Swiss-Prot record, chain A:
The organism's place on the tree of life at top rank: Eukaryota
Additional free-text comment from the UniProt record: Present with 721 molecules/cell in log phase SD medium.
Alphabetically ordered keywords of this record: mRNA processing, mRNA splicing, Nucleus, Spliceosome
Protein name: Pre-mRNA-splicing factor SNT309
Biological source species: Saccharomyces cerevisiae (strain ATCC 204508 / S288c)
One GO BP: mRNA splicing, via spliceosome
From Swiss-Prot, chain B:
Other facts: Present with 11700 molecules/cell in log phase SD medium.
Region of interest (Interaction with CEF1), ranges: 63-120
Subcellular location: Nucleus
Name of this chain's protein: Pre-mRNA-processing factor 19
Taxonomic lineage of the native organism: Eukaryota, Fungi, Dikarya, Ascomycota, Saccharomycotina
Task performed by this protein: Probable ubiquitin-protein ligase involved in pre-mRNA splicing. Acts as a central component of the NTC complex (or PRP19-associated complex) that associates to the spliceosome to mediate conformational rearrangement or to stabilize the structure of the spliceosome after U4 snRNA dissociation, which leads to spliceosome maturation. It is also probably involved in DNA repair.
Signal peptide: none
Ranges for region Required for self-association: 54-128
Homology family: Belongs to the WD repeat PRP19 family.
Quaternary structure and partners: Homotetramer. Component of the NTC complex (or PRP19-associated complex), composed of at least CEF1, CLF1, ISY1, NTC20, SNT309, SYF1, SYF2, and PRP19.
Domain U-box: 1-62
Curated annotation (Swiss-Prot), chain D:
Family: Belongs to the WD repeat PRP19 family.
Function comment: Probable ubiquitin-protein ligase involved in pre-mRNA splicing. Acts as a central component of the NTC complex (or PRP19-associated complex) that associates to the spliceosome to mediate conformational rearrangement or to stabilize the structure of the spliceosome after U4 snRNA dissociation, which leads to spliceosome maturation. It is also probably involved in DNA repair.
Highest rank taxon of the organism: Eukaryota
Classification of source organism: Eukaryota, Fungi, Dikarya, Ascomycota, Saccharomycotina
Quaternary structure note: Homotetramer. Component of the NTC complex (or PRP19-associated complex), composed of at least CEF1, CLF1, ISY1, NTC20, SNT309, SYF1, SYF2, and PRP19.
Domain (U-box): residue spans on this chain: 1-62
More info: Present with 11700 molecules/cell in log phase SD medium. The tetramer is an elongated particle consisting of four globular WD40 domains held together by a central stalk.
Protein name: Pre-mRNA-processing factor 19
Species of origin: Saccharomyces cerevisiae (strain ATCC 204508 / S288c)
Location(s) in or outside the cell: Nucleus
Amino acid sequence: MDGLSFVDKIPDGYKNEIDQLVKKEFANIKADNSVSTLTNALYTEYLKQRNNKKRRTPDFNDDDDTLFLEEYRRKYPRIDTSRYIPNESSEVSLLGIVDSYLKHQEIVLDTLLPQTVSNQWRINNDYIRQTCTIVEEMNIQQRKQINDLEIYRKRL
Amino acid sequence: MLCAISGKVPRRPVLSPKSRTIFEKSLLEQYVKDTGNDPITNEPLSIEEIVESAQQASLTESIPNLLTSLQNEWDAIMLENFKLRSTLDSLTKKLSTVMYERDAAKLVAAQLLMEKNEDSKDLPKSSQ
Amino acid sequence: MLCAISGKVPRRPVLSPKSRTIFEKSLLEQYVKDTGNDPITNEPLSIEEIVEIVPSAQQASSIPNLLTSLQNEWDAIMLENFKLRSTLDSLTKKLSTVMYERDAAKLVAAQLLMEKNEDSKDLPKSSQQDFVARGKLKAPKWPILKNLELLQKTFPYKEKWVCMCRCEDGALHFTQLKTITTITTPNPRTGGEHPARLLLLYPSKTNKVLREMYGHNEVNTEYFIWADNRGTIGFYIVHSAKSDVEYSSGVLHKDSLLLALYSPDGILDVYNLSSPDQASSRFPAKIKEVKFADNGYWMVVECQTVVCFDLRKDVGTLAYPTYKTGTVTYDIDMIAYSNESNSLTIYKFDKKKNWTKDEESALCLQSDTADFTDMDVVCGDAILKTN
Amino acid sequence: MLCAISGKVPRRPVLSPKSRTIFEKSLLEQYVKDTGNDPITNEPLSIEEIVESAQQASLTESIPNLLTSLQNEWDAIMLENFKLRST
């Protein structure tokens, strides 16, 4: 488990080396209704279902069919012209009121970006001290190790 | 400011008293009837336990609401969840490659733990 | 569609304008005449307070529910997207924690390897300072393959006939016409053979099936694994695109889930039968023979060395190197391992040679253990010998 | 966007779980320390009761907002019919 990240100042060759040894040990081991059916089929096939491309074109001196199609264009154009009246009445006040809401929504996210930033650096900060604590202790151990190694020889 | 189920910006937000989290009324009311518990914390919660303005500027070119806008909404719902199902499938596959490579490393360490200390032991014995 | 006094279907639904609850005109009127009150809330109410009769006027008796239906289906869409995302991010936590911990655990090895290495040079620099010939034809001489019936009976393949012979009576029970591999079924009445491109299944002294380098009976007794120079194994029929070469031998592991196939390019390929996948390859000339031990964790392979594999570690723990020597056949009894080819040798598996026979003239093509190792059998390029 | 007690733009909004209303933490905290209550409804509330996941949202713009739009369309057109039924 133990591998000191901050203390071990470990080349790319060692990653490539260790990857090969890990690789060799891997060589050894080796709820909705009908809605979901049509939605998954639409996405898989990459084709959206065609809508009513009729109101836009039409034609004068048609028949009973275009008499309907004509009368459709009138009522929707009157609804359109009424739908543009209540927008222009308020105008830009309704738009800029929503623009202000979006600024309150945005700043909230970036506050959380900082809260995460601080606690993430704070955890790493605690790790750092641990790394330097033990890395010294390991240094102490190795020095003592080398002392015996030659001490035992010089006695013999 | 958002709902904690769909990812909406709620029109009638309602907060639960067991876990302080704001949901849109329709979506929290649906969960309680499906299974009577809080979706996030899995704690007992009922419809009576719940405790209850946003402006969108309708575009200048607002026919399109029936044809173009509604079409795009069910395209965007369709191709996202399909792509999201694709993302979930790969995470489980990439999970299996993670755990296998992990256990492969465990065996290396276990194999090397026997190797190293016995090599060190042999140096201690050599002196004699 | 119900009154809130009797519980009947109201034919004249009147309502009180103090507590919203639709009653029937008869019952509410009888309650008001009894005592001037609303029956549900006990508030003040009179007869004139009640709104009687149906309401349809300037209204006319679709569309609105279609939008309601559109909402109801969306309500599911949101609920589904939530549970799909939870599992998405919750799995990403496992992915992230693993990948981090993997490369963390990877650095353990890099450190460990260099210290292990240091221990080597340090210490190194310091330490420095019966014989039956009539089973098959005399004019086309040679027995090329051998098996013993697991439940009791000898099976040989000849330089084109398959023969079943009884050691006790010294009689040939059957000469089967229709051979470099043979397998004896435990049922005693079924025998299998293969040759330079069929597998044949025999009873009746007859061939009952012709199925179109190695042949092995599955643990169930119901299926045969085969290998071929055509690069495929068969049970289904599969090859390795990547390896793409002749398979030289084939054997099931005793539990019947995995098997091994030797290759002309010196690999021992391990396969998962269920998944039909190549799960491991043991490297280290053409493979000539492989044998799984009944202990379930040893595999012996040959190509002039016999290599021993521990399947729990996937490591080569021992190699017996012979000199010119051809190892053609390997088999465990799991106490003993026999080899045959240039000659016959038997090793004790515990300490790795206990028997050595050189009676055959020319190549030995098969070796086998009688039950409890009470005898050994071998066949040669005409004799079948018992020891 | 506003704090209901002061009327300012709250720089640390915390929503209560008894009278649902967005209060400024520093303001509401003092209200609770005065007496354990919610300022609007005068129901009991403590500091732990006051509260400041993985699905990503996008801003409320012109599917659900589109469906509530079509209600406005039809509900207005239904009144248009009354003007001609009554006349």
